């Protein structure tokens, strides 16, 4: 009584509603410390003349 387990399972079934169906989520957070930026983008090149 008044002492419950803090966690609970998800009811993920193939027939479940879209709202109740599982969804995989990725959150991308960017950081700028007092350090070199080591994660850069492609910066695609062009042909040489």
């Amino acid at each position: 009584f008044n002492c419950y387990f803090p966690l609970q399972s998800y009811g993920f079934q193939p027939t479940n509603g879209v709202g109740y169906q599982p969804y995989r989520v990725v959150v991308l957070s960017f950081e700028l410390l007092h350090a070199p930026a080591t994660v850069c983008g492609p910066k695609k090149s062009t042909n040489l003349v």
Binding site: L33, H34, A35, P36, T38
Partner: protein, 48 residues
């Protein structure tokens, strides 16, 4: 050396015939490695 977070490693290999001490002469060290560590360094040691 370690400057603004980058670890710079230069090196040079040469042949010698001189057990007693460092050879007198002149030779320059080309860079080999540039590490973006951003790590503090104030002490080091060698491993043999």
């Amino acid at each position: 050396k370690n400057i603004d977070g980058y670890f710079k490693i230069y090196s040079k290999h040469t042949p010698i015939n001189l057990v007693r001490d460092l050879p007198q002469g002149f030779s320059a060290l080309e860079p080999l490695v540039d590490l973006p560590i951003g790590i503090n360094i104030t002490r080091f040691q060698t491993l043999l």
